């Protein structure tokens, strides 16, 4: 029973079917000026359309990347560098993925002033802080749509309203697309990170959606692909796969999200019956696929080992920067179990988890001095 | 008949077979601490071994990237930035791919002094220039192993000797691996770009091999993968495919190279019978898969169109910076046809090309005032 979807997902068989022809048969480079090139370009442009449509992205452009990490790098560094004339102040949430944080820290070394937005006890960003700290020289705010460790969905719509078309809003939607509604017009995104494998597409590809008129400096330099923003010969098969994932997700996500929530809730209801167990992240304003719980006296790493031995795959997330931002102590943060659900989980998988986990927790507790 | 291998190659069916299990079945993230993670990590480490062995790379490390473009960016920018204490002077060949040139131009904007190494009429770099221009503050030299436009193989072994362990030598081996012997110890490389699809692996992955003790700044920041040098969750299927490509290439390349040369030579011998035709690049110190010819009075773009209409795919390479570096006039550079061979070409494909091309050239000539 696999409960580590936010670490990696299987490729849907339907996505693999759409991709394969482009590996072997129709293997042209979209820049080539012959029939194989034309077919490759048509495939890319069609994929690009499927990704944009997913997120209601007609008011911007999709730029293909090698994944969410490279897309977040592009968003942070590419926007800040290009727009530094307008100011060098950036607000970044304290619970962003390291592919936003580490680029932000790089900007700090380059003379930008990066201020981290605090979160409350459930990991929600403090919107009043953003409002108080926004300045004339604030050029960029980066707040994830939802947190993939603790499940908390962020108040991106209210953040957009605060910014009032004064600073660009970058939203990392790695955790949200396919789980909750991601409509760039509703959420007021100026840049949106999208991950292919998080929607059961292939690994090794992703996108940054960029609102019309937002200008970025490329990071990956070369032959000028992606209208200059991201060079390198297009990975057509992965692009096709991601597009096919985006079209399936558009069709299926609402149903899937409701199924995940059903499973999720069964887990949370039962796990929280264990003594001295505590849910991390908001209990309600929470991604449908996320269960993050901590247990007093126990090491999360030991829970994951013990579960692995029983044929159940899970995660434990220096302790997590997200957990520390929420105000947990080192020892609380250390007792964490992350269970993340996905397309292939069944009721039987949940049954198994719920039968095995209480005994696991009971042995580990017995070991604690 | 497809003669545009240096734009894109098919994935070998044997490579696809090795990859597929990792898409759907064994889809773990190598950083996960459970059985699916362990299998994924074992696959990655095994691939990494197959790539290193291909190039005799035991004296260094393979860093996985999204392709040759990203690997060249890493080599140029990552090395120069990390090593700038030692000097800010860089020598780059005039005929390097734009994924080296454009990073070099970026360094020039950042205060590095980049000097372009000239080439002679066949596109060979001027080694005496490197020797004359090397200084105490020269930290990096980037010279491709061979040129993928004109086929010319570069005197990398003699360049290594010139440098005398004074400056790092970056060799872009996109064009050479699988075509000619690429042994990092023989050629004295400190960093080597390797492209997966150029060896019939999947698109969207590649590597920079880095000699032990050479230090680089990462460009793609995030979760710390690739020992900190290139963050992002590993694209296991593509990595596996690239490894499988590297193991096949190690086994098969000498044979394949001799077959390509046979085909290549048949083409060159016959094409050069056409009046007022001229080979670009060296006639002998030349990649086995490359035929680059120009025709007086004719537009290469028209030759490619006409060939496309006959079911033959080829290339024409502002005119090519490589051709201009070799001293061609605008009108000469504009009459170029590039035919690049590969694993699936047959004698029948060559027959077809040789039957069709003389008529193509005759019509186009008729149109010239
Ligand atoms: C010599 C060479 N180097 C680098 C690259 C960059 O390759 P890619 O577009 O596969 O990233 C190319 C393009 N084939 C090339 O010919
Ligand atoms: C919210 C979020 N954002 C960005 C990423 C970076 O993703 P990747 O490692 O697929 O490039 C991750 C890792 N899953 C994440 O959870
Ligand atoms: Ca604006
Ligand atoms: Ca040295
Ligand atoms: Cl909160
Ligand atoms: Cl020469």
XYZ file of C-alpha atoms and ligand atoms in Angstrom:
774
model
C 0.000 0.000 0.000
C 1.630 3.134 -1.364
C 0.947 6.343 0.564
C 3.788 8.495 -0.699
C 2.229 10.215 -3.674
C 3.767 13.582 -2.947
C 7.177 11.993 -3.422
C 6.374 10.347 -6.760
C 3.359 9.138 -8.741
C 2.896 6.468 -11.352
C 2.370 7.523 -14.953
C -1.226 6.793 -15.984
C -1.361 4.091 -18.587
C -3.362 6.395 -20.835
C -0.597 9.017 -20.676
C 2.048 6.452 -21.520
C -0.013 5.407 -24.546
C -0.083 8.987 -25.825
C 3.668 9.431 -25.327
C 5.126 6.363 -26.845
C 4.664 7.212 -30.507
C 6.882 10.225 -30.056
C 9.762 8.158 -28.628
C 10.378 5.935 -31.582
C 8.071 6.788 -34.540
C 7.422 10.493 -34.599
C 10.710 11.624 -33.076
C 11.319 14.942 -34.807
C 12.650 18.124 -33.326
C 9.991 20.896 -33.402
C 12.541 23.358 -34.796
C 13.250 21.202 -37.881
C 11.864 22.393 -41.180
C 10.451 19.188 -42.504
C 7.507 16.912 -41.975
C 8.921 15.230 -38.843
C 9.600 18.683 -37.381
C 6.089 19.871 -38.234
C 4.466 16.947 -36.506
C 6.609 17.432 -33.436
C 5.752 21.131 -33.287
C 2.036 20.421 -33.672
C 2.253 17.942 -30.766
C 4.047 20.479 -28.565
C 1.624 23.329 -29.348
C -1.358 20.972 -28.638
C 0.125 19.910 -25.307
C 0.791 23.522 -24.427
C -2.940 24.147 -25.053
C -4.030 21.251 -22.811
C -1.858 22.594 -19.946
C -3.043 26.190 -20.332
C -6.695 25.154 -20.465
C -6.379 23.113 -17.290
C -5.646 26.229 -15.255
C -7.784 28.709 -17.245
C -4.557 30.135 -18.582
C -5.676 31.941 -21.737
C -4.372 35.203 -20.329
C -0.822 33.966 -20.342
C 1.737 31.570 -21.763
C 2.929 28.096 -20.698
C 6.715 27.675 -20.572
C 7.891 24.072 -20.467
C 10.573 23.155 -17.979
C 12.206 20.009 -16.608
C 9.812 20.058 -13.643
C 8.462 22.102 -10.756
C 11.951 22.788 -9.346
C 13.187 24.417 -12.539
C 9.861 26.282 -12.945
C 10.169 27.722 -9.418
C 13.724 28.740 -10.112
C 12.572 30.529 -13.260
C 9.713 32.255 -11.426
C 11.861 33.548 -8.571
C 15.155 34.304 -10.178
C 13.901 35.012 -13.703
C 11.253 37.483 -12.563
C 13.337 39.171 -9.871
C 16.318 39.679 -12.153
C 14.274 41.093 -14.987
C 12.174 43.390 -12.787
C 14.784 44.631 -10.337
C 14.521 48.141 -11.832
C 11.141 48.322 -10.055
C 12.484 47.305 -6.690
C 14.436 44.535 -4.967
C 12.077 43.642 -2.134
C 10.513 40.093 -2.287
C 8.112 38.405 0.071
C 8.304 34.615 0.227
C 6.256 32.337 2.478
C 8.056 30.599 5.333
C 6.632 27.244 4.273
C 7.541 27.285 0.561
C 9.276 24.338 -1.011
C 13.070 24.488 -1.082
C 12.922 25.129 -4.827
C 11.488 28.536 -3.930
C 13.449 29.137 -0.731
C 16.827 28.341 -2.130
C 16.381 30.620 -5.182
C 15.173 33.341 -2.707
C 18.363 32.880 -0.653
C 20.373 33.212 -3.824
C 18.615 36.517 -4.520
C 19.510 37.664 -0.994
C 23.171 37.064 -1.886
C 22.649 39.197 -4.987
C 21.378 42.163 -2.994
C 17.671 41.589 -2.977
C 15.817 42.054 0.296
C 13.824 38.863 0.927
C 11.374 38.832 3.840
C 9.739 35.574 4.871
C 6.019 35.603 5.505
C 5.096 33.857 8.778
C 2.424 31.271 9.199
C 0.094 30.409 12.016
C -0.169 27.168 13.896
C -1.930 25.360 11.053
C 0.612 26.637 8.464
C -1.638 29.331 6.955
C 0.209 32.418 5.768
C -0.392 35.654 7.665
C -2.129 37.874 5.069
C -2.044 40.880 7.432
C 1.768 40.590 7.392
C 1.816 40.741 3.586
C -0.500 43.773 3.695
C 1.786 45.530 6.359
C 5.010 44.693 4.629
C 4.124 45.468 1.017
C 6.046 48.475 -0.204
C 6.476 50.498 -3.381
C 9.706 48.515 -4.047
C 8.119 45.115 -3.506
C 8.294 43.434 -6.900
C 7.410 39.738 -6.161
C 5.442 37.704 -3.659
C 5.651 33.885 -3.708
C 2.974 31.950 -1.799
C 2.171 28.358 -2.563
C -1.395 27.415 -3.360
C -1.266 24.695 -0.742
C 1.368 22.982 1.331
C 2.313 19.521 0.231
C 3.739 18.516 3.654
C 0.872 19.514 5.919
C -1.986 19.929 3.424
C -2.912 23.463 4.303
C -4.431 25.423 1.478
C -3.368 29.087 1.425
C -5.586 32.190 1.035
C -4.244 33.054 -2.395
C -7.382 34.865 -3.522
C -7.142 37.302 -0.615
C -3.451 37.736 -1.182
C -4.078 38.659 -4.805
C -6.516 41.373 -3.643
C -3.900 42.767 -1.233
C -1.302 43.038 -3.877
C -3.715 45.142 -5.988
C -1.550 44.921 -9.055
C 1.508 46.257 -7.240
C 3.685 43.191 -7.081
C 3.729 39.983 -9.099
C 2.181 36.958 -7.386
C 3.925 33.677 -7.941
C 1.916 30.635 -6.821
C 3.539 27.251 -6.636
C 0.656 24.934 -7.589
C 2.666 21.685 -7.471
C 0.510 20.489 -4.599
C -2.871 21.801 -5.754
C -3.393 21.101 -9.460
C -5.664 18.055 -9.758
C -6.662 18.274 -6.089
C -8.458 21.618 -5.757
C -9.626 24.176 -8.321
C -6.672 26.042 -9.854
C -7.927 28.883 -11.968
C -5.333 31.541 -12.537
C -7.992 34.236 -13.007
C -9.718 33.337 -9.702
C -6.488 33.191 -7.741
C -4.856 36.217 -9.421
C -1.634 34.433 -10.249
C 0.969 36.151 -12.364
C 3.169 33.040 -12.492
C 2.016 29.499 -11.678
C 4.233 26.416 -11.200
C 2.725 23.207 -12.587
C 4.217 19.729 -12.132
C 3.628 16.932 -14.650
C 4.185 13.931 -12.410
C 1.915 15.399 -9.729
C -0.889 15.005 -12.279
C 0.288 11.446 -13.275
C 2.245 12.688 -16.203
C 5.892 11.779 -16.757
C 8.618 12.956 -14.393
C 11.207 15.346 -15.782
C 8.825 17.944 -17.192
C 6.698 20.720 -15.808
C 5.676 24.297 -16.599
C 5.628 27.828 -15.489
C 2.535 29.625 -16.625
C 3.299 33.333 -17.070
C 0.641 36.024 -17.280
C 0.715 38.176 -20.465
C 2.963 41.166 -19.960
C 4.971 39.646 -17.121
C 8.590 39.648 -18.221
C 11.315 37.207 -17.064
C 15.036 36.653 -17.688
C 15.708 33.109 -18.842
C 17.910 30.979 -16.665
C 18.658 28.188 -19.162
C 20.429 29.781 -22.137
C 21.006 28.369 -25.606
C 19.074 27.935 -28.800
C 16.100 30.111 -27.913
C 13.318 27.608 -27.398
C 10.259 28.485 -25.368
C 10.252 31.934 -27.044
C 13.689 32.553 -25.550
C 12.768 31.765 -21.995
C 13.985 28.171 -21.680
C 16.436 26.818 -24.205
C 17.035 23.215 -25.129
C 15.580 20.902 -27.739
C 12.035 20.076 -26.729
C 11.408 16.845 -24.909
C 8.382 16.049 -27.127
C 7.380 12.746 -25.543
C 7.323 14.160 -22.051
C 5.560 17.318 -23.224
C 2.902 15.169 -24.968
C 2.486 13.099 -21.834
C 2.094 16.186 -19.669
C -0.517 17.523 -22.046
C -2.426 14.288 -21.998
C -2.199 14.344 -18.152
C -3.602 17.876 -18.169
C -6.525 16.920 -20.395
C -7.337 13.846 -18.217
C -7.010 15.925 -15.067
C -9.350 18.601 -16.415
C -11.941 15.834 -16.973
C -11.434 13.764 -13.894
C -10.047 15.786 -11.056
C -13.266 16.695 -9.288
C -14.234 13.069 -8.944
C -10.750 12.019 -8.007
C -10.509 14.769 -5.372
C -13.779 13.626 -3.766
C -12.487 10.004 -3.701
C -9.223 11.059 -2.129
C -11.109 13.024 0.485
C -13.181 10.008 1.333
C -10.077 7.972 1.880
C -8.258 10.726 3.642
C -11.053 11.272 6.083
C -11.287 7.576 6.917
C -7.612 7.704 7.773
C -7.733 10.850 9.819
C -10.829 9.779 11.755
C -9.247 6.502 12.696
C -5.602 7.484 13.214
C -6.603 10.289 15.562
C -8.180 7.693 17.853
C -4.616 6.678 18.768
C -3.584 8.160 22.068
C -1.491 11.278 21.951
C -1.838 11.761 18.225
C -2.198 15.221 16.611
C -2.963 16.380 13.093
C -0.505 18.809 11.533
C -1.969 21.408 9.144
C -5.470 22.763 8.935
C -8.186 20.136 9.574
C -10.570 21.520 6.981
C -8.849 23.930 4.581
C -6.729 21.010 3.504
C -5.796 19.155 0.365
C -7.840 16.005 -0.187
C -4.776 13.791 -0.496
C -2.929 14.759 2.712
C -2.682 13.179 6.172
C 0.160 14.532 8.358
C -0.002 13.325 11.961
C 2.401 13.294 14.844
C 2.668 10.955 17.817
C 4.124 11.740 21.175
C 7.279 9.837 22.276
C 7.874 8.253 18.792
C 10.258 8.991 15.895
C 8.538 9.377 12.514
C 11.509 7.737 10.813
C 10.801 4.619 12.891
C 7.161 4.634 11.929
C 8.138 4.765 8.239
C 10.622 1.879 8.717
C 8.032 -0.196 10.498
C 5.410 0.531 7.860
C 7.918 -0.330 5.059
C 8.489 -3.682 6.703
C 4.743 -4.277 6.453
C 4.611 -3.322 2.803
C 3.324 0.235 3.295
C 5.160 3.204 1.878
C 4.985 6.538 3.642
C 7.108 9.594 4.549
C 8.190 11.738 7.403
C 7.866 15.014 5.173
C 17.280 19.240 10.468
C 13.541 18.850 11.034
C 11.036 20.109 8.471
C 11.194 23.819 7.938
C 7.444 23.762 7.407
C 6.827 22.188 10.793
C 9.194 24.580 12.490
C 7.483 27.559 10.844
C 4.213 26.372 12.368
C 5.781 26.551 15.849
C 6.342 22.906 16.595
C 9.155 21.874 18.925
C 12.044 19.764 17.528
C 10.668 16.628 19.316
C 7.122 17.208 17.957
C 8.359 17.822 14.481
C 10.432 14.600 14.774
C 7.304 12.397 15.493
C 5.612 13.058 12.169
C 4.098 10.615 9.696
C 3.022 11.786 6.225
C 0.570 9.726 4.292
C -0.316 11.106 0.850
C -2.945 9.526 -1.326
C -3.462 9.240 -5.004
C -5.145 7.825 -8.012
C -4.432 4.143 -7.368
C -5.192 3.928 -3.698
C -8.069 1.678 -2.783
C -10.246 1.045 0.202
C -8.198 -2.067 0.792
C -4.989 -0.017 1.072
C -6.667 2.137 3.718
C -7.974 -0.905 5.557
C -4.415 -2.270 5.636
C -2.936 0.955 6.942
C -5.511 1.247 9.671
C -4.989 -2.336 10.789
C -1.199 -2.104 10.836
C -0.559 1.429 12.224
C -1.912 1.103 15.808
C 0.423 -1.853 16.492
C 3.329 -0.004 14.984
C 2.682 2.974 17.247
C 2.238 0.698 20.300
C 5.755 -1.015 19.775
C 7.544 2.221 19.223
C 5.965 3.679 22.356
C 7.091 0.700 24.353
C 10.687 1.558 23.338
C 10.516 5.115 24.641
C 12.243 5.791 27.967
C 14.664 8.749 -45.547
C 15.643 10.593 -42.387
C 18.971 12.433 -42.494
C 18.507 14.815 -39.594
C 19.939 12.853 -36.706
C 21.709 15.801 -35.155
C 18.319 17.427 -34.667
C 16.682 14.416 -33.009
C 17.083 10.637 -32.828
C 14.671 7.819 -32.197
C 14.808 6.024 -28.863
C 16.177 2.502 -29.366
C 13.543 -0.081 -28.670
C 15.875 -1.752 -26.194
C 16.190 1.503 -24.232
C 12.438 1.956 -24.150
C 12.099 -1.579 -22.776
C 14.468 -0.771 -19.914
C 12.649 2.472 -19.083
C 9.063 1.480 -19.028
C 8.993 -0.387 -15.734
C 10.010 2.777 -13.957
C 7.099 4.783 -15.407
C 4.271 2.783 -13.976
C 5.515 -0.096 -11.749
C 8.659 0.960 -9.973
C 7.910 4.674 -9.747
C 9.549 5.646 -6.469
C 11.511 8.748 -5.683
C 15.178 7.899 -4.912
C 15.087 10.128 -1.825
C 12.216 8.159 -0.229
C 13.061 5.935 2.697
C 11.174 2.843 1.749
C 11.411 -0.046 -0.644
C 10.138 1.905 -3.678
C 12.694 4.625 -2.913
C 15.490 2.072 -2.553
C 14.761 0.510 -5.900
C 14.644 3.890 -7.574
C 17.966 4.895 -6.026
C 19.596 1.624 -7.078
C 18.396 2.229 -10.660
C 19.788 5.772 -10.667
C 23.180 4.770 -9.217
C 23.429 1.911 -11.809
C 22.630 4.279 -14.670
C 25.156 6.758 -13.351
C 27.727 3.918 -13.525
C 26.832 3.030 -17.132
C 27.284 6.691 -18.192
C 30.584 7.132 -16.350
C 32.000 3.900 -17.756
C 31.139 4.902 -21.306
C 33.565 7.815 -21.166
C 36.182 6.248 -18.846
C 34.920 8.573 -16.156
C 36.101 6.883 -12.959
C 38.119 9.960 -12.079
C 35.030 12.078 -11.748
C 31.301 12.242 -11.133
C 28.270 12.207 -13.464
C 25.684 14.917 -12.764
C 22.308 14.322 -14.384
C 20.661 17.213 -16.160
C 17.688 17.802 -18.453
C 19.980 17.560 -21.488
C 23.105 18.902 -23.153
C 21.871 22.519 -23.011
C 21.474 22.492 -19.240
C 24.782 20.593 -18.846
C 26.618 23.243 -20.897
C 25.025 25.971 -18.852
C 26.214 24.253 -15.678
C 29.737 23.793 -17.056
C 30.162 27.410 -18.139
C 28.287 29.362 -15.555
C 28.630 26.916 -12.657
C 32.393 26.573 -13.029
C 33.108 30.226 -13.794
C 31.058 31.493 -10.872
C 32.595 29.112 -8.387
C 36.179 29.648 -9.564
C 36.176 33.380 -10.221
C 38.551 33.903 -7.270
C 41.223 32.370 -9.534
C 40.552 34.670 -12.437
C 37.761 35.837 -14.738
C 39.294 35.154 -18.140
C 37.557 32.405 -20.259
C 38.395 31.110 -23.693
C 35.492 29.728 -25.716
C 35.647 28.391 -29.271
C 34.022 30.464 -32.005
C 32.100 27.435 -33.248
C 30.579 26.224 -29.958
C 26.900 25.463 -29.725
C 24.682 28.320 -28.569
C 24.242 26.557 -25.228
C 27.899 27.392 -24.595
C 28.014 30.753 -26.365
C 24.986 32.217 -24.724
C 26.137 31.283 -21.187
C 29.569 32.806 -22.131
C 27.835 36.045 -23.183
C 26.005 36.057 -19.887
C 29.354 35.788 -18.096
C 30.614 38.752 -20.138
C 27.696 40.772 -18.735
C 28.771 39.694 -15.253
C 32.294 41.025 -15.695
C 34.128 38.025 -17.002
C 36.485 38.521 -19.929
C 35.488 36.005 -22.618
C 37.742 35.661 -25.667
C 36.584 33.590 -28.620
C 39.042 31.153 -30.123
C 39.183 31.406 -33.934
C 38.995 28.533 -36.325
C 40.528 27.876 -39.690
C 38.777 27.272 -42.958
C 37.735 23.732 -42.044
C 36.442 24.840 -38.595
C 39.417 23.527 -36.588
C 40.276 25.604 -33.538
C 43.567 27.501 -33.582
C 45.582 25.813 -30.795
C 48.409 28.363 -31.153
C 45.859 31.064 -30.243
C 44.919 29.209 -27.052
C 48.621 28.821 -26.206
C 49.257 32.640 -26.859
C 46.202 33.801 -25.011
C 46.348 31.614 -21.909
C 47.092 33.695 -18.853
C 47.484 33.240 -15.109
C 43.858 34.468 -14.716
C 42.434 32.122 -17.330
C 40.160 29.796 -15.381
C 38.139 27.950 -18.121
C 38.494 26.906 -21.734
C 35.505 25.418 -23.599
C 36.206 23.581 -26.869
C 33.809 21.068 -28.308
C 35.062 17.599 -29.102
C 33.659 17.887 -32.598
C 31.335 20.191 -34.458
C 27.882 18.864 -35.085
C 27.185 21.261 -38.005
C 30.285 20.709 -40.110
C 31.664 17.470 -38.634
C 35.101 18.729 -37.784
C 36.728 16.975 -34.884
C 38.800 19.293 -32.673
C 42.361 18.752 -31.359
C 41.265 18.358 -27.759
C 44.223 16.205 -26.755
C 46.678 18.911 -27.807
C 44.601 21.556 -26.128
C 44.697 19.619 -22.871
C 48.519 19.547 -23.081
C 48.615 23.327 -23.624
C 46.523 24.022 -20.631
C 48.994 22.029 -18.480
C 46.685 21.975 -15.513
C 46.307 25.755 -15.481
C 42.737 26.162 -16.600
C 39.773 23.799 -16.593
C 38.921 22.242 -19.958
C 35.262 21.868 -20.722
C 34.517 19.655 -23.737
C 31.053 19.528 -25.190
C 30.824 15.905 -26.380
C 27.208 16.088 -27.604
C 28.402 15.449 -31.138
C 31.129 12.889 -30.434
C 29.927 10.300 -27.914
C 28.957 7.160 -29.848
C 30.716 8.394 -32.993
C 34.394 8.642 -32.029
C 36.324 7.537 -28.940
C 35.504 9.744 -25.938
C 37.819 8.925 -23.094
C 38.069 11.694 -20.567
C 41.573 10.612 -19.516
C 42.843 10.640 -23.134
C 41.295 13.996 -23.937
C 42.106 15.632 -20.576
C 38.590 16.855 -19.950
C 37.716 18.439 -16.643
C 34.021 18.696 -17.546
C 32.301 16.753 -20.338
C 28.780 17.347 -21.714
C 26.930 14.149 -22.638
C 23.549 14.023 -24.394
C 21.143 11.105 -23.938
C 19.168 11.399 -27.154
C 22.368 11.705 -29.196
C 23.095 8.136 -28.075
C 19.455 6.994 -28.776
C 18.401 7.477 -25.225
C 15.353 9.528 -24.259
C 15.208 13.275 -24.847
C 15.039 15.505 -21.790
C 18.049 14.105 -19.949
C 21.788 14.406 -20.223
C 24.866 14.752 -18.016
C 27.829 16.782 -17.120
C 30.747 14.653 -16.103
C 32.928 16.565 -13.630
C 36.498 15.615 -12.792
C 37.202 14.946 -9.073
C 38.199 18.149 -7.343
C 36.606 20.462 -9.896
C 34.108 22.597 -8.024
C 30.938 24.190 -9.488
C 28.090 26.411 -8.262
C 24.727 24.818 -8.962
C 22.383 26.677 -11.237
C 19.172 24.770 -10.434
C 18.481 25.238 -6.716
C 16.143 23.288 -4.460
C 16.136 20.022 -2.600
C 19.809 19.181 -3.007
C 19.775 16.309 -5.461
C 22.839 15.441 -7.487
C 24.965 16.036 -4.352
C 23.736 19.631 -4.326
C 24.666 20.435 -7.875
C 21.329 19.983 -9.650
C 18.146 19.941 -7.628
C 14.845 18.387 -8.565
C 13.303 14.980 -8.019
C 15.118 12.504 -10.220
C 13.579 11.603 -13.531
C 14.231 7.868 -12.947
C 12.803 6.534 -16.204
C 14.833 8.885 -18.338
C 17.947 8.305 -16.235
C 17.493 4.516 -16.633
C 17.046 4.938 -20.362
C 20.170 7.066 -20.645
C 22.118 4.464 -18.725
C 20.881 1.693 -20.940
C 21.819 3.862 -23.983
C 25.304 4.303 -22.532
C 25.772 0.573 -21.997
C 24.559 -0.215 -25.569
C 26.759 2.527 -26.979
C 29.817 1.223 -25.137
C 29.181 -2.169 -26.800
C 28.157 -1.086 -30.236
C 29.584 2.263 -31.136
C 32.699 1.155 -32.976
C 30.677 -0.927 -35.378
C 28.023 1.708 -35.744
C 30.637 4.407 -36.413
C 32.208 2.308 -39.189
C 28.737 1.770 -40.754
C 27.959 5.461 -40.614
C 31.277 6.229 -42.242
C 30.518 3.840 -45.040
C 27.255 5.575 -45.696
C 28.676 9.003 -45.227
C 31.443 8.403 -47.688
C 29.052 7.091 -50.329
C 27.140 10.327 -49.970
C 30.112 12.622 -50.054
C 31.720 10.851 -53.016
C 28.564 11.127 -55.039
C 27.217 14.528 -53.976
C 30.551 16.176 -54.717
C 30.192 15.077 -58.342
C 27.510 17.776 -58.649
C 28.876 20.868 -60.298
C 29.895 23.691 -58.038
C 29.464 21.723 -54.848
C 31.830 22.091 -51.853
C 32.214 20.204 -48.597
C 32.109 22.266 -45.417
C 34.296 21.048 -42.529
C 37.383 18.903 -42.606
C 37.250 16.091 -45.207
C 39.036 13.568 -43.025
C 39.139 14.640 -39.368
C 35.381 14.431 -39.420
C 32.584 12.728 -37.564
C 31.329 9.585 -39.283
C 27.728 10.775 -39.345
C 28.189 14.211 -40.964
C 27.791 15.502 -44.527
C 27.659 19.319 -44.848
C 27.826 20.538 -48.447
C 27.115 23.798 -50.165
C 26.008 24.533 -53.716
C 26.612 27.678 -55.657
C 23.566 29.790 -56.682
C 21.084 27.773 -54.498
C 19.403 28.377 -51.116
C 19.828 25.521 -48.627
C 16.337 26.168 -47.283
C 15.002 25.386 -50.768
C 16.971 22.183 -50.958
C 15.480 21.071 -47.621
C 11.944 21.947 -48.824
C 12.452 20.050 -52.038
C 13.881 17.048 -50.221
C 10.957 17.115 -47.706
C 8.551 16.965 -50.614
C 10.322 13.790 -51.724
C 10.132 12.221 -48.296
C 13.702 13.021 -47.216
C 14.417 14.921 -44.043
C 17.487 17.109 -43.813
C 18.717 20.454 -42.411
C 20.426 23.635 -43.344
C 22.468 23.636 -39.932
C 21.312 35.171 -39.540
C 23.451 32.506 -41.208
C 25.225 29.854 -39.148
C 27.754 31.270 -36.765
C 29.852 28.176 -37.372
C 29.965 28.787 -41.104
C 30.765 32.440 -40.621
C 33.587 31.580 -38.210
C 35.103 29.419 -40.942
C 35.218 32.453 -43.263
C 32.358 31.711 -45.593
C 30.502 34.569 -47.264
C 26.792 35.113 -46.432
C 25.772 33.676 -49.870
C 27.999 30.578 -49.420
C 26.767 29.976 -45.939
C 23.180 30.307 -47.275
C 23.635 27.409 -49.835
C 24.265 24.720 -47.243
C 22.698 21.285 -46.890
C 23.292 19.195 -43.750
C 22.729 15.500 -43.895
C 23.371 13.655 -40.620
C 23.208 9.907 -40.366
C 22.319 7.511 -37.656
C 21.479 4.110 -36.385
C 18.471 3.413 -38.609
C 19.762 4.640 -41.914
C 20.082 2.010 -44.590
C 21.738 1.651 -47.933
C 18.329 2.164 -49.461
C 17.978 5.570 -47.772
C 21.320 6.590 -49.273
C 20.341 5.270 -52.685
C 17.177 7.388 -52.494
C 19.033 10.530 -51.502
C 21.554 10.134 -54.268
C 18.864 9.579 -56.879
C 16.741 12.529 -55.778
C 19.362 15.217 -54.922
C 20.906 15.910 -58.373
C 17.464 16.751 -59.820
C 16.668 18.928 -56.860
C 19.892 20.869 -57.348
C 19.286 21.142 -61.124
C 15.725 22.771 -60.629
C 16.901 25.193 -58.036
C 19.794 26.242 -60.264
C 17.423 26.846 -63.118
C 15.600 29.370 -60.882
C 18.708 31.420 -60.163
C 19.056 34.703 -62.060
C 27.129 20.251 -30.145
C 25.790 20.422 -29.500
N 25.822 20.745 -28.273
C 24.697 21.053 -27.483
C 23.473 20.878 -28.017
C 22.320 21.249 -27.141
O 21.557 20.047 -27.238
P 19.999 19.952 -26.690
O 19.252 20.929 -27.582
O 19.721 18.372 -26.895
O 19.817 20.342 -25.229
C 23.330 20.633 -29.443
C 21.985 20.566 -30.088
N 21.987 19.293 -30.676
C 24.579 20.403 -30.229
O 24.682 20.027 -31.498
C 5.135 22.085 -3.284
C 6.252 21.489 -4.082
N 6.804 22.281 -4.907
C 7.931 21.978 -5.695
C 8.403 20.715 -5.680
C 9.617 20.463 -6.513
O 9.159 19.334 -7.257
P 10.185 18.413 -8.172
O 11.129 17.812 -7.144
O 9.120 17.432 -8.891
O 10.980 19.193 -9.211
C 7.923 19.773 -4.683
C 8.519 18.410 -4.553
N 7.410 17.570 -4.727
C 6.779 20.203 -3.824
O 6.094 19.469 -2.956
Ca 1.551 44.339 -14.174
Ca 42.984 21.412 -10.807
Cl -2.566 28.878 10.685
Cl 40.648 24.559 -40.108
